[PDB]
Each structure stands twice: as structure tokens, then as C-alpha cells.
Amino acid sequence: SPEALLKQKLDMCSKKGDVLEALRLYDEARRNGVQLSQYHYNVLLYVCSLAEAATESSPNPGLSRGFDIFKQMIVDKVVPNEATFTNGARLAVAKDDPEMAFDMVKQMKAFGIQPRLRSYGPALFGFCRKGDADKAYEVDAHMVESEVVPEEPELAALLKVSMDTKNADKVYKTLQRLRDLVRQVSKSTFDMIEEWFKSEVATKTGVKKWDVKKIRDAVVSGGGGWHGQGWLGTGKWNVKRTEMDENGVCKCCKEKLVCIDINPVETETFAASLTRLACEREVKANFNQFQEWLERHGPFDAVIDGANMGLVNQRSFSFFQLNNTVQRCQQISPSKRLPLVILHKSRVATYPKNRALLEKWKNAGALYATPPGSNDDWYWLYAAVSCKCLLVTNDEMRDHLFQLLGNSFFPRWKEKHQVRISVTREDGLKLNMPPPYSIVIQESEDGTWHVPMSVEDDLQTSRQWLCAKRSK
Ligand SMILES: *C1=CC(=O)c2cccc(O)c2C1=O
Numbered sequence: 001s002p003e004a005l006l007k008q009k010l011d012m013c014s015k016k017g018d019v020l021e022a023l024r025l026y027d028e029a030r031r032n033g034v035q036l037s038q039y040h041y042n043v044l045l046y047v048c049s050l051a052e053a054a055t056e057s058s059p060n061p062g063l064s065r066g067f068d069i070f071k072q073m074i075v076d077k078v079v080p081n082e083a084t085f086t087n088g089a090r091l092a093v094a095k096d097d098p099e100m101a102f103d104m105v106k107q108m109k110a111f112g113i114q115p116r117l118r119s120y121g122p123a124l125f126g127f128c129r130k131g132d133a134d135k136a137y138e139v140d141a142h143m144v145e146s147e148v149v150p151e152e153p154e155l156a157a158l159l160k161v162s163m164d165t166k167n168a169d170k171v172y173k174t175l176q177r178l179r180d181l182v183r184q185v186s187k188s189t190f191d192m193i194e195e196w197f198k199s200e201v202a203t204k205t206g207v208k209k210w211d212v213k214k215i216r217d218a219v220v221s222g223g224g225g226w227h228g229q230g231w232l233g234t235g236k237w238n239v240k241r242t243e244m245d246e247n248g249v250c251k252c253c254k255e256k257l258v259c260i261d262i263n264p265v266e267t268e269t270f271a272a273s274l275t276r277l278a279c280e281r282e283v284k285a286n287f288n289q290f291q292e293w294l295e296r297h298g299p300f301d302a303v304i305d306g307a308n309m310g311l312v313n314q315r316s317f318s319f320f321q322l323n324n325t326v327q328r329c330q331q332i333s334p335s336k337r338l339p340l341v342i343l344h345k346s347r348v349a350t351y352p353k354n355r356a357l358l359e360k361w362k363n364a365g366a367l368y369a370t371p372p373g374s375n376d377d378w379y380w381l382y383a384a385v386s387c388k389c390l391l392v393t394n395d396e397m398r399d400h401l402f403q404l405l406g407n408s409f410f411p412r413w414k415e416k417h418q419v420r421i422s423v424t425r426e427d428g429l430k431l432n433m434p435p436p437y438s439i440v441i442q443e444s445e446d447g448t449w450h451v452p453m454s455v456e457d458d459l460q461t462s463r464q465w466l467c468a469k470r471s472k
């Protein structure tokens with residue numbers, strides 16, 4: 001078959017990086033009357049993206065024809081899959097021309113195609129590299145219109161280009177988007193925010209007088225921890241790297257950070273999504289059987305990830321560590337409820353009194369053994385969300401399938417619900433409880449900023465904050 005042969009030969013072109021041959025096969029296909037499909041185009045886009053951008057000549061046919069191929073693919077009305085967007089972006093990156101990259105996203109839009117975050121990257125990051133804030137903000141407006149939500153790298157580039165063009169309003173807006181969407185910032189973003197607050201433009205942007213009641217109302221309206229009404233105060237910012245004490249009090253300025261509530265409606269929506277996700281990945285009847293069991297049990301004050309409590313910092317499963325955690329959770333329960341222990345059925349062992357205790361927990365309504373083949377993470381997570389209670393795990397809950405849970409609601413929920421264990425020689429096992437404040441960029445009523453750095457494990461490493469406070 002002619003289409004199957006083209007596929008065969010383009011696959012070989014891809015495997016060898018033979019761009020001049022792929023372009024001859026593409027043309028030969030036009031001359032032969034062979035219709036290209038989604039798959040054919042996706043190989044061509046990949047193959048074309050391997051061509052270099054020409055510094056010492058007019059651009060090479062590889063990238064030049066690649067953009068013509070992308071334009072023809074869209075004109076044919078072939079449906080893009082995830083490899084189309086990825087390969088389209090690789091081409092844009094190779095060309096290193098943000099205007100042409102932005103033209104690709106404009107083309108998609110004009111033919112009713114929803115662009116992906118990675119399609120915008122080459123455009124946004126290209127314009128930001130050139131210091132062209134105006135085009136960067138056009139690309140940003142285009143994303144907002146298309147409902148593609150930026151991540152930290154896009155916001156960081158927007159912040160940097162705003163700083164470069166001395167645009168204090170855009171710096172302010174971008175910092176609010178970082179607060180809203182990212183909460184805690186990477187090292188590179190943290191350093192960039194510090195540079196902003198110490199800069200001349202920051203020193204010279206401000207207001208001496210403002211309506212304290214308009215600030216008050218925006219604080220109530222926003223959910224807490226910010227107001228969004230603009231830079232306040234005047235003069236130089238005193239900018240220090242610092243820490244919060246266990247109560248959320250800044251060690252530099254003594255401001256008490258606030259605790260931001262989670263709207264119960266968001267929690268309901270999240271619980272429904274979690275249930276849907278769990279049923280897609282588990283055997284539906286297994287997960288449903290747990291849901292039915294959970295409805296008949298409780299109440300619970302805590303849910304334990306049994307595997308994690310047994311295994312964290314251990315060379316093999318420690319019944320001691322599991323059992324010590326159960327006991328300690330029961331002790332902090334106001335009515336001494338056993339925590340709900342979630343374990344794999346293969347665990348539920350070798351010492352008779354330990355097996356007897358596991359069976360006693362089960363008989364007390366405080367243990368569920370997840371079935372053969374299951375991923376027990378869905379079970380303890382659904383349990384803690386549904387019971388609105390503490391979740392005891394040292395799992396960071398960020399990688400692999402935890403990415404399916406998103407980066408807005410879930411990190412906020414974790415912060416309020418996750419209990420982690422730590423062990424010392426002097427004291428043994430400790431429960432580390434949720435903080436009494438929210439670890440998020442905060443803007444106070446008087447215009448003081450506290451910016452938290454993102455870290456892997458905030459019990460291992462002491463989290464650095466920026467305190468930016470006007471010196472007058
Ligand atoms: C925010 C404030 C607070 O006082 C508190 C107390 C106990 C448990 C919490 O999660 C919180 C909180 O998130």
C-alpha cells in the first residue's frame with residue numbers, strides 16, 4: 001500500500017536523521033497523489049526539527065520547509081495528537097524565531113485547534129530572551145484567551161521581561177499570578193524576586209497615601225493573605241532572607257503569616273475527580289468495594305499509609321515503626337480513635353502477636369487490606385479526603401501518578417492534612433503536624449511581602465523565605 005510504504009520510509013528517515021530524504025519523499029508523495037495522514041506529518045515535523053538554524057547563510061531547507069509542512073498539515077484539516085504539538089514545538093525551538101513560533105499557535109487557533117502549553121513556550125521564551133515585553137504580553141494574552149494556564153517557567157520569563165522593561169505594574173501582576181498558581185518558588189525565581197525588591201525601579205515605585213478600607217475589603221474578598229491593590233509604601237525595600245518560626249512568625253519583621261482557608265466546594269470537586277481517577281486505574285469493583293467498606297466504618301481522625309510507615313528509612317518493613325505510628329496517632333486523637341491503617345493484603349506477618357494485632361485492628365474497624373494488584377495510594381488518599389482527616393505518610397506525593405492530581409488544590413490540601421514522621425536518637429519517633437499558617441507568597445495589608453522558596457522536604461531542609469518590607 002502507498003501510504004504504508006511512505007510511513008515505512010519516513011520511519012527510516014527519522015531513525016537516521018535523513019532530512020533531505022524525508023523532504024524528497026514528501027515531494028514524491030505529492031507527485032504520486034498519496035494523501036499524508038496524522039502519522040506521516042508527525043514524522044516530518046520531527047525530522048525537520050533536526051536541521052540547524054543557519055548563521056552564515058539564508059536558512060536551510062530543513063527548517064524552512066518544516067514550517068511550510070506544518071502550514072500544509074493544518075490546511076488539510078488533519079487532527080493533531082500529542083506528538084503533533086511536541087514535534088511542532090521542537091521545530092519552533094530549532095528555528096529560534098519567536099514570531100514564526102507565535103504564527104504556528106495563531107494558525108492552530110484560526111482552524112479551531114486548542115494549543116498546548118509547550119506550543120506557546122518557543123514564542124514566549126523567544127520574545128522574553130530578546131527583551132521584547134510587548135510581544136511577550138501578546139503571547140500571554142493569547143494563552144489567557146485560549147485558557148492555557150502558565151506554569152512557573154512562563155511566569156518567571158514574564159517577571160524577568162517586566163523587570164527588564166521597568167514595568168512595575170506587570171511585575172506586581174506577575175507576582176500575584178505566582179502566588180495564585182505556584183505558591184512557592186524555585187531558587188531561580190526566588191533570586192529574581194529578590195533582585196526586583198532590591199532594584200531602583202522597586203525603590204521608586206509606590207504610594208504614600210491609600211484607602212485602608214479598600215485594602216481591608218480586598219483582603220476579605222481574595223480569600224486571605226493578599227489584597228492585589230498595588231504596591232504600597234515608598235522608598236527603599238529592606239529585603240532579607242529569613243525563616244518562619246513554627247507559628248508562622250517572620251524572624252526578620254515579626255509579622256504573623258496567615259492561614260488561608262480551603263473552600264469546601266473545591267474539596268468536593270477534588271473528591272469527585274479523585275474517585276473518577278481511581279476507578280480508571282484500579283479494577284472498578286475493587287475500588288468500589290473499598291468505598292462501600294469506608295461508608296460502613298469510621299469515624300476516623302487519621303489515615304495511615306501503612307507501607308510508607310513500615311518502610312521509610314528502613315532496610316526492610318518495620319512492624320515496630322508502623323505500630324509506634326498507630327499508637328502515637330491514637331494518643332493525639334481527642335477521643336483515642338485508632339487511625340485507619342491501609343496496607344496491601346500481602347502484608348496482613350511473621351511474629352504471631354504482630355499478626356494478631358493486625359487482625360485486632362481489622363476487627364476494630366481500623367484496617368483495610370487492599371486487594372491483589374491494587375495500587376494502595378488511591379485507597380489512603382481517598383480515605384483521608386473523604387473522612388476530612390489527617391493523612392500520615394512521608395510520601396512526597398508529587399511524582400508519577402500524583403501528577404494526575406494537579407498543582408493547585410492538591411498541594412494546598414496536603415499542607416493542611418499531611419502528617420510526616422521523623423526519628424531522632426534522643427527522642428524516637430515524632431509526628432510533624434500541619435503548619436498553623438499557609439506556606440505561600442503573602443502580601444500584607446501594609447504592603448509587606450513574604451515569599452517562600454520551594455523545597456523537596458521542609459523537615460530535612462529549613463525553608464528560606466524572602467521578607468520585603470519598606471524601610472519607612
Ligand atoms: C491554619 C491555621 C491554623 O490555626 C491551623 C490549626 C490546626 C491545623 C491547621 O491545618 C491549621 C491551619 O491550616
Ligand SMILES: [Cl-]
Pocket residue numbers: none
Ligand atoms: Cl469528632
Ligand SMILES: [Cl-]
Pocket residue numbers: 353
Ligand atoms: Cl502483648
Ligand SMILES: [Mn+2]
Pocket residue numbers: 305307308376377395
Ligand atoms: Mn505507596
Ligand SMILES: [Zn+2]
Pocket residue numbers: 250251252253254255450467468469
Ligand atoms: Zn518579615
